[PDB]
Paper text:
GTP tubulin is known to assume a curved conformation in solution and a straight conformation when integrated in the MT lattice. Here, we modified our original method for the preparation of human α1β3 tubulin to purify Drosophila α1β1 tubulin. We first determined the crystal structure of Drosophila WT tubulin within T2R, a complex composed of two tubulin heterodimers and one stathmin-like domain of the [name] protein.
Although tubulin structures within the T2R complex showed the T5 loop in the same “out” conformation with GTP in both WT and Y222F mutants, the situation could be different in oligomers. Despite the lower concentration range employed, Y222F tubulin assembled much faster than WT tubulin. With Y222F(GTP) tubulin showing rapid nucleation, 31% of the oligomers were nearly straight, whereas with WT(GTP) tubulin showing moderate nucleation, only 12% of the oligomers were nearly straight. The results showed that the interdimer interaction is stronger in the Y222F oligomer than that in the WT oligomer by 1–2 kBT (ΔGolig = –9.8 ± 0.2 kBT and in the range of –10.7 to –12.1 kBT for WT(GTP) and Y222F(GTP) oligomers, respectively). As we compared the dynamic instability of WT and Y222F MTs in the GTP condition, the Y222F mutant showed a reduced catastrophe frequency and higher growth rate. The effect of GTP hydrolysis could be less pronounced in the Y222F mutant, as the T5 loop does not switch back to the “in” conformation.
Residue numbers in the entry:
A (entry chain E): 4 to 30, 44 to 143
B (entry chain B): 1 to 278, 283 to 432
C (entry chain A): 1 to 38, 45 to 438
D (entry chain C): 1 to 37, 45 to 439
E (entry chain D): 1 to 278, 283 to 431
Write the structure that this text describes.
């Protein structure tokens, strides 16, 4: 039964009041701050994107280094094959000529001896 | 977040990509000539996510078709929906990649990479609001793996703010083409860890097993394998091409699915499992989420813990029943979800079922069990690398042995990371 | 004149605005083309008038993506709004607070303030703003907090009242919603004067239980939300007597600046398809006010203490019957108030009857009531949210998405520490 | 595009080239005059003149004119331009030293000049296919010199061989093991892949499978041509699965020196019989692991496979191939090394194996050619090495080589290199 | 490797040389006037190896006929096929060599050597692709032995890159009683060891024995001995004259037959053994490879080991049967082939049989048993040299005793070398 009703307002489409059952037991930012925070965030977002592109540029450079390595290795293989073969063809030419020069030296000496035999036959004959 | 630019690279990438285009065209009511002849407004509401509207009522796939060899391009052009593609978007070399990642990434792939960028740039500049890129490729060959990963990093350079998504076909000795597959796959995983946002792991080991064990096909062919891949890709993209609230775009999907940057490798799931020549209730479909038999990656979901899962239900079914069954599947299987990622399973229901089915379910899982797939590749890799077998074909291309040790280390680190979070408890 | 500008942010804010403005038109006799074949002139606080005799909402609808606002631009009410007040960007905040606040929001913020300034220019006695937004979305969270900050700079002592959608798993769109909620609450705490929170789960369950709707859609939820918003704003749009101006909301419900989160309760919520039932008495609808099943936010007022209670009656209601209803409730229930506040209620009767959207899920009732009570029990909603935040943040799960947008990890620590201080404040205020 | 230049060296290389080019003409519908009344892959092996005639991308070389003169006056004398049929006056007299140095050096530049002119007409040269015997003075010595000069002029450009391994049944010289070891040593570093063909194996298959009492080179070369055509069908046609020069190398060669695949072919049916019926895909696949169908005599059960490439042709379906390979995977008798996770490269061409009309081979619906890297092929090197040692220990016939400018140290170097190769096959067959 | 230049020196060389030319002319269908009247294309395919094509359709033997005495040359001109030879190619002196090697090599022979070189140079320069030279001569006389060996060294000096081949008739006391034959033969062997690539040893001891023991000719004449030589020479040159794969040229034959430079002395074999007025089966023919009775050098093939063998079968026979029988003959007789020269027996089959026969077999053997022939010459030589008998015949011509000691040493070394490889094991 103890309920204090207090009228507040009454208008065209309304009415208001307070009902009290018991009394109580115990009686700014700035645009600059905002802009500083948003620009700091944009710089971090741009920095990580820029570092990504720097690393992707490092992978493009590696791609070029492997292609250059492949081309240098093919050219070095050609260089080694060329001088190995030139050495082999020239050693063989020296050897074949040396073998055939030695066999013609033998034949030449035998023909010098033949004229020496002819010389002795001539002095045995006549005299 | 509107347009997606699709790229398909190499034999595998072009084969699964052509199959993707033929399934989603049928679903959207688009014929082989690009003409729309459907009977629903939902079919055209988000048609622009994958198709460009050309001169007079026709729709053309926003697809770039890539290969270092022409044969694959010819077979696609001749195929069922071959004429739907933009002729200028077929980019191909003549040399081939010789099933060598080093040739695709550094030598012949590098010579053709600019021709591809020019075609994808033309497609991207035409976009009112580009979401990003979707690449289908194999990790076992030369072009899809080597050139596909080279393209990702060149596109990363020009479009660093766009989403990079891949459908990556993992090799298996069960359906193998080349002896060096573990090298090509490891060198590609290393690239995907660093440069993609979302990678769907399409394992040939799991697809072969589904065909052989479940579909009872004694001798499965790539057509049998690719029928599962086409149903799976139709299911994972449902959110992107039909009206809906959840994971409607590539970035929203990534934010919901990837808690840690390197852990972006998804294990796709699908029910019902069908063969090419021909039921299923809501509780039956929800159960297949923990069924290794329904997984497209050769991992057991009960072997790990799900970090995040997206479940897509299609066809005429009760949303109330789907909601009840999805709550029950998470509560009953609490031990297979990480406790420190609350409400990590998001469900979506679409009234349009995939081509040929009346009801379906597709699960995009980010599970720590995917480490089994990476461990399998790592063990096949070390078996060859220990003996330096076939290494002259990579070093002959200008590669150093160091890139192999680095690719292997990064992959073992990724396995170690999945294991770390599998064991991670809420009580630190 | 006491004009109020409504700002609808993101998908939730815009879709709730659709329900609100449709209902205000029904309540004031305004047709979808802005015409009204003309009670009182108080409706002018929410509607300006053009030279052609058409009534235009004092409202701005903002989204970082255009899909949702495009439905308003092409819908039944496309003539009610002028296109300059429906603002959209091209790319959304991808459910990321940092993306909506620091990256995308930053480029459209000036345009929104410019349009707000043009609406404020048409006001003779601008009371302040009513901002509708979700806690969970990247735009509802990030863009709203950025907008609150600039509104404090441009409109110093102007009142800012929020209607905020508290995340619920049943209709949740993102895993990171607890992060966005704590981050937006931290940045908005100092710039808001009063925020009426609405838990999607509470309204989802009221739709299922009271309206017999199997799988409630946003259409169903927003129709219900709209009834509650209409009940709250009724005394600004009609010549009412309680909460007749925006400043009165802070005076009657907010004793301390940080504890500005009233709990909303509404009754009766009756199904339209219900077999011709007998009308609920004043006593019956008042009793329902004190039932947790009728609350907008899930929490237990038995576990807390009231610091203010406002009863907003509507329709066929007599003060004699209200006083008798309140007398019985004190007799039977506890109604514990904090020791420094008197135990009591501020009662308001708005004679304008409860209006429902024809063809909707709600039945037209003869009398209804909306209670706004500042209770310490609402800290249970913050505790739920804070715990989910901690679970993910301990592992830095998904944090890379925010840091990648330019945010620092320190902001997560600052935001969570601020909501830990808020939890302690509710505890301190409820002590004796 | 993707061109291949064929180099035929000495009597064996030229006579095998006769069989191959006759068969390619039959397979592509090219008449002996170069005319052909659409795949177009044959352009890898045939260039086209302004007059629409198709000319082989081939050079035929011999140090004596007798053998090449048969091409110059034969049925296909209009198919080749006379500048691509190169001959000297004096042969190498079954001496490697004469082929490589004394006689070869006088014609080497001319041959390179003509190869350069064929290379000029190539837009995408894959590499070279060199056909030669191991035993002949020209086949051994001139090929070694040519291999070396091609590495200088074309660097690392793919160089693949078809080498005739000596057999006593048809052997022409006692010193053939010397010529084989010297050419293998010189060639090891310049070749990317060498397909060896043992004359005794071709001889015995002709006797057993084709019922030919005393097989002639005509009979051997017709069968060899069938095998060479199978290896090049993937290059000259576009079937279900193709394999280029690079794909052969990558799959079959794990280490640079280990570049000797074993060739197997099935079915080899006599043009007689008729009651042979048609062999299934499984039947022809199984036959490839039978030692009776091998091109080199060796026992694969005594070794381990590191790679297997299956080249199918005709009425072959991939489903049928996979089933056949699956049964082969389960064969205990077929052992692979532990460091090779997968050793199967499959290629399928729709064009059945065409036979020379009037020949010894029957027209089959489907056929297969397997290329396998087995450590068992080291048995062929061991046979050859032993015969070398027997003669070299006494310096028997060595004076013939030394007399031409060669040094004895070259014999020691060549034999030591083949001893290292034998150790390499042993090491590679070991488990890890 | 196309043309061969043939030289025949002295009485013996001209007699066996004329017989070679008449047998191969008949086989190739060439008449005494040089006209071809054959029927087979195989007859003319390699006709250029031995014949020049002259004005009109005539074929002229690429042969130089040499002698220090005119008689044998007159006999050849008068003989069957005498007119086939180029008249300018008959080079003869008047003096003779008096069965003295020193006169042929150093005195009379040296005076006529330039006239011969003039004619062989004209023949050799006319060649599109010269294989080398083929010389028929005796080792026991003066001209064939002395001048023939002088010609080899002079021709070698001008053509060091060509093959030097000889058909050398070894003396025997059975046929010829001219006492110094062991000296003339030893001085010639010494020259042949150093300057020829291949020497066919035609032993008069073996020829006499075949005629006497097998052909039952009580008193054999040079005509009877030379009928065996003509059949043997037709057989050994089969590979050079007809199309074929094996040993088709002089260098390819040498590379297949000679493992050591000095060991280039061949033991020719022939079956069937026929009289001047006379068919075996394939197994019968293959057996004669180890039959000392069928050898043209007086050595037993079973006494040594074959380093290399070329077996030539002629006539209408099965190549399959020849292959089966040849495998059986080396498997059954494994102990007579050196183990350290693998597959050292090469077989060839020609459809054209020799003149007068329907089937034949010819064996070119490089056997260590040939040391028996050299030992026989060495013992005969030492028997005379020990006493310095007839030395003034050689020293009177300007020779030193030292050339004799050197020729003897070289020959004993050659015997010692055959013995060394006969005993050499694979170990
Ligand atoms: N599921 C599936 N896997 C495929 C298909 N084609 C190839 N693969 C797999 O992909 C891997 C080979 O990669 P590919 O894409 O074919 O190679 P590539 O890029 O064409 O390389 P090149 O031939 O050098 O141009 C292997 O592990 C195959 O099992 C296909 O149509 N479907
Ligand atoms: N009651 C209600 N909640 C909604 C509505 N639309 C979205 N939500 C809730 O809002 C949260 C998602 O935030 P949204 O407002 O859709 O996102 P946004 O503000 O547009 O931000 P972005 O799309 O990320 O740029 C989830 O908790 C949803 O359940 C709606 O119409 N009514
Ligand atoms: N399969 C086969 N082997 C052959 C053929 N011709 C020769 N041979 C073999 O090749 C080896 C001999 O080498 P050849 O090629 O004839 O000699 P070449 O290369 O002409 O050298 P020279 O004549 O010495 O200058 C022996 O093993 C023969 O059996 C042929 O047509 N087919
Ligand atoms: N088989 C054979 N041996 C012959 C023939 N004529 C001579 N001989 C042998 O040759 C040796 C004698 O040598 P000749 O050729 O006659 O003498 P030369 O070479 O002409 O020398 P000179 O008579 O001095 O001018 C002896 O061993 C004879 O047995 C012949 O026609 N056939
Ligand atoms: Mg391909
Ligand atoms: Mg939105
Ligand atoms: Mg030759
Ligand atoms: Mg005389």
């Amino acid at each position: 039964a103890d309920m204090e009703v207090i009228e507040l307002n009454k208008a065209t489409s309304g009415q208001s009041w307070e009902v009290i059952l018991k009394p109580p037991s115990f009686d700014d930012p700035s645009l600059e701050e905002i802009q500083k925070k948003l620009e700091a965030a944009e710089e971090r977002r741009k920095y990580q994107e820029a570092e990504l592109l720097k690393h992707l540029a490092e992978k493009r450079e590696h791609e070029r280094e492997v292609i250059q390595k492949a081309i240098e290795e093919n050219n070095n293989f050609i260089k080694m094959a060329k001088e190995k073969l030139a050495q082999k063809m020239e050693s063989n030419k020296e050897n074949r000529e040396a073998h055939l020069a030695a066999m013609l030296e033998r034949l030449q000496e035998k023909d010098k001896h033949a004229e020496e035999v002819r010389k002795n036959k001539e002095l045995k004959e006549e005299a | 977040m509107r347009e997606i630019v699709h790229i398909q690279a190499g034999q595998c990438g072009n084969q699964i990509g052509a199959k993707f285009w033929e399934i989603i065209s049928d679903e959207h009511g688009i014929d082989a000539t690009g003409a729309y002849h459907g009977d629903s407004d939902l079919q055209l509401e988000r048609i622009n996510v994958y198709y460009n509207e050309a001169s007079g009522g026709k729709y053309v796939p926003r697809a770039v078709l890539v290969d270092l060899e022409p044969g694959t391009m010819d077979s696609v052009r001749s195929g069922p929906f071959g004429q739907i593609f933009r002729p200028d978007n077929f980019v191909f070399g003549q040399s081939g990649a010789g099933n060598n990642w080093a040739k695709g990434h550094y030598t012949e792939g590098a010579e053709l990479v600019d021709s591809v960028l020019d075609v994808v740039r033309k497609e991207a500049e035409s976009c009112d609001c580009l979401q990003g890129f979707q690449l289908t490729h194999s990790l076992g060959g030369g072009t899809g793996s080597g050139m596909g990963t080279l393209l990702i990093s060149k596109i990363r350079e020009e479009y660093p703010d766009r989403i990079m998504n891949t459908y990556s076909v993992v090799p298996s000795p069960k359906v193998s083409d080349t002896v060096v597959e573990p090298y090509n796959a490891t060198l590609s995983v290393h690239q995907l860890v660093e440069n993609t946002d979302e990678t769907y792991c399409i394992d040939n080991e799991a697809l072969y097993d589904i065909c052989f064990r479940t579909l009872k096909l004694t001798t499965p062919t790539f057509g049998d394998l690719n029928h599962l891949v086409s149903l799976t890709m139709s299911g994972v993209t449902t959110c992107l091409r039909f009206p809906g609230q959840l994971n409607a775009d590539l970035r929203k999907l990534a934010v919901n699915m990837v808690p840690f940057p390197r852990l972006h490798f998804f294990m796709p799931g699908f029910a019902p499992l069908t063969s090419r020549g021909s039921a299923l209730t809501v509780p039956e479909l929800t159960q297949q989420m923990f069924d290794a038999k329904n997984m497209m990656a050769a991992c057991d979901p009960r072997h790990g813990r799900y970090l995040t899962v997206a479940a897509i239900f299609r066809g005429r079914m009760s949303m109330k029943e789907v909601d009840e069954q999805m709550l029950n599947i998470q509560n009953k299987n609490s031990s297979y979800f990480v406790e420190w990622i609350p409400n990590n399973v998001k469900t979506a229901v679409c009234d349009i079922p995939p081509r040929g089915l009346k009801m379906s379910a597709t699960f995009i899982g980010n599970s720590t069990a995917i480490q089994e797939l990476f461990k399998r590749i790592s063990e096949q890799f070390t078996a060859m690398f220990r003996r330096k077998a076939f290494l002259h074909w990579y070093t002959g291309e200008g590669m150093d042995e160091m890139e192999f040790t680095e690719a292997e280390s990064n992959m073992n680190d990724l396995v170690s990371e999945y294991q770390q979070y599998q064991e991670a408890t809420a009580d630190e | 004149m006491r004009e109020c500008i409504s700002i609808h942010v993101g998908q939730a804010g815009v879709q709730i605005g659709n329900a609100c403005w449709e209902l205000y038109c029904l309540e004031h006799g305004i047709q979808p083309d802005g015409q009204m074949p003309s009670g009182d002139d108080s409706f002018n606080t929410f509607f300006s008038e053009t030279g052609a005799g058409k009534h235009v909402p004092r409202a701005v609808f903002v989204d970082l993506e255009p899909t949702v606002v495009d439905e308003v631009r092409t819908g039944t009410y496309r003539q009610l709004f002028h296109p300059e007040q429906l603002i959209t960007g091209k790319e959304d905040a991808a459910n990321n607070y940092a993306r909506g606040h620091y990256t995308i929001g930053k480029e459209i913020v000036d345009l929104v303030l410019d349009r707000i300034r043009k609406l404020a220019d048409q006001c003779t006695g601008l009371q302040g703003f009513l901002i509708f937004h979700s806690f969970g979305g990247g735009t509802g969270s990030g863009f709203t907090s950025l907008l609150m900050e600039r509104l404090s700079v441009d409109y110093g002592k102007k009142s800012k009242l929020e209607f905020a959608i508290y995340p619920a798993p049943q209709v949740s769109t993102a895993v990171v919603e607890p992060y966005n909620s704590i981050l937006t609450t931290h940045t908005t705490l100092e710039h808001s004067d009063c925020a009426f929170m609405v838990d999607n789960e509470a309204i989802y369950d009221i739709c299922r239980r009271n309206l017999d709707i199997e799988r409630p859609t946003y259409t169903n939820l927003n129709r219900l939300i709209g009834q509650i918003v209409s009940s709250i704003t009724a005394s600004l749009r009609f010549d009412g007597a309680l909460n007749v101006d925006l400043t009165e909301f802070q005076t009657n419900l907010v004793p301390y600046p940080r504890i500005h989160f009233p709990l909303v309760t509404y009754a009766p919520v009756i199904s339209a398809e219900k077999a011709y039932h007998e009308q609920l008495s004043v006593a019956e609808i008042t009793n329902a006010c004190f039932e947790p099943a009728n609350q907008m936010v899930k929490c237990d007022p038995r576990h807390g203490k009231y610091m203010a209670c406002c009863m907003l009656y509507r329709g066929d209601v007599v003060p004699k019957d209200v006083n008798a209803a309140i007398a019985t409730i004190k007799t039977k229930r506890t109604i514990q108030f904090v020791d420094w506040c008197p135990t009591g209620f501020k009662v308001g009767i708005n004679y304008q009857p409860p209006t429902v959207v024809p063809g909707g899920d709600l039945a037209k009732v003869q009398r209804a009531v909306c209670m706004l009570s500042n209770t310490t029990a609402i800290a249970e909603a913050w505790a739920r949210l804070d715990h989910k935040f901690d679970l993910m943040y301990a592992k830095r799960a998904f944090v890379h998405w925010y840091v990648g947008e330019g945010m620092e990890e320190g902001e997560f620590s600052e935001a969570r520490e601020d909501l830990a201080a808020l939890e302690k404040d509710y505890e301190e205020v409820g002590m004796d």
